[PDB]
Design a protein around this ligand. Structure first.
Ligand SMILES: Nc1ncnc2c1ncn2[C@H]1CC[C@@H](COP(=O)(O)OP(=O)(O)OP(=O)(O)O)O1
Ligand SMILES: OC[C@H]1O[C@@](CO)(O[C@H]2O[C@H](CO)[C@@H](O)[C@H](O)[C@H]2O)[C@@H](O)[C@@H]1O
Ligand SMILES: [Mg+2]
Ligand SMILES: [Mg+2]
Lengths: 556, 411
DNA sequence: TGGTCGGCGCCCGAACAGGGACTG
DNA sequence: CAGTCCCTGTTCGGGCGCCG
């Protein structure tokens, strides 16, 4: 009985027919070796680590890095080869807690388990596979071989085992204290009660005793008796919260890696700072080779970055969640497929903010993008608060009614009201349901040669108007669009158009207001200027009317 | 202390690994209460992360129920167990169930909790319960008994089920009983009152073997939706062009359709609104066509090996059309639904109701659930569908975006 | 020095799916 | 009647941000 047993362990098999890691250690610099040897020798006295005779034929590299904002060192094991051969787990960490989720509490304590991984026993049979060899100041001294007796850092089963073990320990305390709120994230514990401050500290120490029984130690150094608490990168005050300050690089010359940090910082910032825009800054990253390559900022990404910094200038804060009051999400259109939103309960006191900028589809409109933002906000809300906010949307009720009733896809927005904050979202044009009496009828078609990439686009009309245009470096699809563009260019304010192109009719019937294709944009530009457009489809090669005549012209 | 039938996955197939999706506060509260009682009764027990399999869980309320029902999305597990339930213990399908004037559906899922489950199989029934705002990590469970919604539960319990049924069946030979997953379909030709009474008899019969259900179907009322051609006193060029396009598409289904005499009417290059008188040849060609569309397609018959496919079209004004088939253009049934719940206010609720109704008809007619081609965007459906779901099974679906060039199914 | 693990978010590009139209 | 080519949309893994 050389090593004692503490808390219930988790059986951990290897992947079938596979064996423990063997790989030689790193040429570690002696400066790092000083820190590692001191800490590692200490482990054996506790029982966290054990010596092994060469009967253990396993070697895995080892390294270390300083704990941020501390003198202490972190002991990591590059278990990349052991992970590959270790059984798969199911992660129990399903997301990140958000402060906007928190309800107001009279007394808040944040406490941190010490050596959290090293306090949880590894599986007894699995302990052998940990084996690694320590290094010395010279290559003369061999160094001892060690096997972990507890969860180690760098393995792939460590987080899930710790989180599940921690939850099992906490569950009896939370059953005895139903009215205490414990947010458990890894080893960080947030404890909140409406108990008066003296009574609350009684429960806090009583909880510390409960964790102590299983060998979990909460040092005073990481204890947080007094606000503002530091938790999950936020600063928690009694009635408000905010992100811990974010430093944005000042570089005069920007590389590729530079922009990534910038973008990723601004995404973190946009959860509370309203109106952050990353569109033009991200435009700089598309289709680039080297992470090291230097890139100059366009006057678009520069202007953007300028106002982005100025938004950060003023301090902003979020509030907490009041289950009694409604949740409200308001969305604004920011241009160039960019949308921002605010979730609040009392007007002008935001719980959180955010942006939806994703460009989805080659052809789209503002109504679809607004629907996407509503869905993204809805799921985000269900995670944080477990309910859907009421929506305030910059789209007239009749606009939305016209879109969803006529669209061929099922589409829906949950309970919402119109807010008259411009720019309003609208449909730029409407296709007629019936043919227009007294409007010229344009029969349009186009064809192209797969090999030469040459083609023709043209129309014929009931009044006798005709056109054929030669085109170079095109496709059948592109000439079918071109034919429609020609009819729109050459027609009056009301026009009937008959095509046999399912491709073109499908794009145009969805009422797009923006397109990646410049040709579609020009078609859109023309559709907006018309008073009435009726588009109709007929099957090709059926000997129909004008369609047969124009097909002969463009085929030539 | 009952023997546990061993179960295995289809060869070469690992267990389900499907992330749990976010749940509303009401559903999480319902699940926590349901799972606490199930753990106390030994039906489920908590498990660690060492189990690498997960299946999504959520809660529903059946029509008019008001009481939460736990529902596990076992579709991934069921496909992985697919050979076992159909090949080994599968239930024969009563061709007569669709003919009965009244069919009631009963939730017998609770019975499955009696039997225990193969210890080696329980690792695959794992499900995680999420927490609001991720206050806690996921609380994982696994099943110790036969789970509701798994396709092995009705098969393993079929031996037990028939013995319980057998006294009732002999007492009423005419009545037809079919079992699909958690459901018992009970079809009689009796008058309404006698039928409801006989269901109570089968309820007590289930009660003394260790559940009230009120969902009534009338498969004889069920009708189909023929392709229909407009009747017009006068026809414009646009009308004839629409008609020719519809008939040409229809000719992929009924090969006897002819458009020649109707095409003759659109020889020129004419304005769309110009009125065109019909010739006698076109009137007769249109007449012969309308007759053909009343007829059935030649050689369309159900094939038990092949999967059912369901397609749905949104026609507007609360109207939806569907086709069930196995081969393209060989439609086993075609229908229309109108004035469903959420009509004129909610497409997603209406589409959800439609999927449920279509699946129910397929269970009654063929004992299968179809794979749905849904006219909706993937993200729109996934956000909302669980909010409107009132059934204990879940069909397979995929998402399509077909803009409608011609209104073949509706008018 | 360069180097580990799990979770979530964004934006990217590449690889893959599949539906029509047209070519033999 | 296959086999392409267009064109579109999805998925998945990469980089970064953030949390232990
Ligand atoms: N860079 C990293 N790599 C691998 N695992 C990491 C990690 N950073 C954190 N973890 C894992 C390892 C365990 C946990 C780390 O949390 P603490 O920073 O608080 O270190 P703790 O062990 O608790 O010692 P204490 O500070 O209390 O004295 O998350
Ligand atoms: O809606 C698609 C979503 O399906 C998931 C998650 O539940 O899979 C379930 O639905 C699929 C489509 O019917 C089934 O094929 C699958 O077996 C079932 O688990 C997703 O992984 C998928 O993205
Ligand atoms: Mg700690
Ligand atoms: Mg043509």
């Amino acid at each position: 009985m050389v090593p004692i047993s503490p808390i219930e362990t988790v059986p951990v098999k290897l992947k079938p027919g596979m064996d423990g890691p063997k790989v030689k250690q790193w040429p570690l610099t002696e400066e790092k070796i000083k820190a590692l040897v001191e800490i590692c020798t200490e482990m054996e006295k506790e029982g966290k680590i054990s010596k092994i005779g060469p009967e253990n034929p396993y070697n895995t590299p080892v390294f270390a890095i300083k704990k941020k904002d501390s003198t202490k060192w972190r002991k990591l094991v590059d278990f990349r080869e052991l992970n590959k051969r270790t059984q798969d787990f199911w992660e129990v960490q399903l997301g990140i807690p958000h402060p906007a989720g928190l309800k107001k509490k009279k007394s808040v304590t944040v406490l941190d388990v010490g050596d959290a991984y090293f306090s949880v026993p590894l599986d007894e049979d699995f302990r052998k596979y940990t084996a690694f060899t320590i290094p010395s100041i010279n290559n003369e001294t061999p160094g001892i071989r060690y096997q972990y007796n507890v969860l180690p850092q760098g393995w792939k089963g460590s987080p899930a085992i710790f989180q599940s073990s921690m939850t099992k320990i906490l569950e009896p305390f939370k059953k005895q204290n139903p009215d205490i709120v414990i947010y458990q994230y890894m080893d960080d514990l947030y404890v909140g009660s409406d108990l008066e401050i003296g009574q609350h500290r009684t429960k806090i120490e009583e909880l510390r005793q409960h964790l102590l029984r299983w060998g979990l130690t909460t040092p005073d150094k990481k204890h947080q008796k007094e606000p503002p608490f530091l938790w999950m990168g936020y600063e928690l005050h009694p009635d408000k919260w905010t992100v811990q300050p974010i430093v944005l690089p000042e570089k005069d010359s920007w590389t590729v890696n530079d922009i990534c940090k910038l973008v990723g910082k601004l995404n973190w910032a946009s959860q509370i700072y309203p109106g952050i825009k990353v569109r033009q800054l991200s435009k700089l990253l598309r289709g680039t080779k080297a992470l090291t390559e230097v890139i100059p900022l366009t006057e678009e990404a520069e202007l953007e970055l300028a106002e982005n910094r100025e938004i950060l200038k003023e301090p902003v804060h979020g509030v907490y969640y009041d289950p009694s009051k409604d949740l409200i999400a308001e969305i604004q259109k920011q241009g160039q497929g960019q949308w921002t939103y605010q979730i609040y309960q009392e007007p002008f006191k935001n719980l959180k903010t955010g942006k939806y900028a994703r460009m989805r589809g080659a052809h789209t409109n503002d109504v679809k993008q607004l629907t996407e933002a509503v869905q993204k906000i809805t799921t985000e809300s269900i995670v944080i608060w477990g309910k859907t906010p009421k929506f305030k949307l910059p789209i007239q009720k009749e606009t939305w009614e016209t879109w969803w009733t006529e669209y061929w896809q099922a589409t829906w927005i949950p309970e919402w009201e119109f807010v008259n904050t411009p720019p309003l979202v609208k449909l730029w044009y409407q296709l007629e349901k019936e043919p227009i009496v007294g409007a010229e009828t344009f029969y349009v078609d186009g064809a192209a040669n797969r090999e030469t990439k040459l083609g023709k686009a043209g129309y014929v009309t009931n009044k006798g108007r005709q056109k054929v245009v030669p085109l170079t470096n095109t496709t059948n699809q592109k000439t079918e669009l071109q034919a429609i563009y020609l009819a729109l260019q050459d027609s009056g304010l009301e026009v009937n158009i008959v095509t046999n192109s399912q491709y073109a009719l499908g794009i145009i019937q969805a009422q797009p207001d923006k397109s990646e294709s410049e040709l579609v944009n020009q078609i859109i530009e023309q559709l907006i200027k018309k008073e009435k457009v009726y588009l109709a489809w007929v099957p090709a090669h059926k000997g129909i009317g004008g369609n047969e005549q124009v097909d002969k012209l463009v085929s030539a | 202390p009952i023997e546990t039938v061993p179960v295995k996955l289809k060869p070469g197939m690992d267990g389900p690994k499907v992330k749990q999706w976010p749940l509303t506060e009401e559903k999480i509260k319902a699940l926590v209460e349901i799972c606490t009682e199930m753990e106390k009764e030994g039906k489920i027990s908590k498990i660690g992360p060492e189990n690498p399999y997960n299946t999504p869980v959520f809660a529903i309320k059946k029509k008019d129920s008001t009481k939460w029902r736990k529902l596990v999305d076992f579709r991934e597990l069921n496909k992985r167990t697919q050979d076992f339930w159909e090949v080994q213990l599968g239930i024969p399908h009563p061709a007569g169930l669709k003919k009965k004037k009244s069919v009631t559906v009963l939730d017998v899922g609770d019975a499955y909790f009696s039997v225990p489950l193969d210890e080696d199989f329980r690792k695959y029934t794992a499900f995680t319960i999420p927490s609001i705002n991720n206050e806690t990590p996921g609380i994982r469970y696994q099943y110790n008994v036969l789970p509701q919604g798994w396709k092995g539960s009705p098969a393993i319990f079929q031996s037990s089920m028939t013995k319980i049924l057998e006294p009732f069946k002999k007492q009423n030979p005419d009545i037809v009983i079919y079992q699909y997953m958690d459901d018992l379909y009970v079809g009689s030709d009796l008058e309404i009152g006698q039928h409801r009474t006989k269901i109570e008899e089968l309820r007590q019969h289930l009660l003394r073997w260790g559940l009230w259900m009120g969902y009534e179907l009338h498969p004889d009322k069920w009708t189909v939706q023929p392709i229909v051609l407009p009747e017009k006193d006068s026809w414009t060029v646009n009308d004839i062009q629409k008609l020719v396009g519809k008939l040409n598409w229809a000719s992929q289904i009924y090969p006897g359709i002819k458009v020649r005499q109707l095409s003759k009417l659109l020889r020129g290059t004419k304005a769309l609104t110009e009125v065109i008188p019909l010739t006698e040849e076109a009137e007769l060609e249109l007449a012969e066509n309308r007759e053909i569309l009343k007829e059935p397609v030649h050689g369309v018959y159900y094939d038990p090996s092949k999967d059912l496919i369901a397609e749905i079209q949104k026609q507007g004004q609360g109207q939806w059309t569907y086709q069930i088939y196995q081969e393209p253009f060989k439609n086993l049934k075609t229908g229309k639904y109108a004035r469903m719940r959420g009509a004129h206010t909610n497409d997603v609720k209406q589409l959800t109701e439609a999927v449920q109704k279509i699946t129910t008809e397929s269970i009654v007619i063929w004992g299968k659930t179809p794979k749905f081609k849904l006219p909706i965007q993937k993200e729109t459906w996934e956000t909302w569908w669980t909010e409107y779901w009132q059934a204990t099974w879940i069909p397979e679906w995929e998402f399509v975006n077909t803009p409608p060039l011609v209104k073949l199914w509706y008018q």
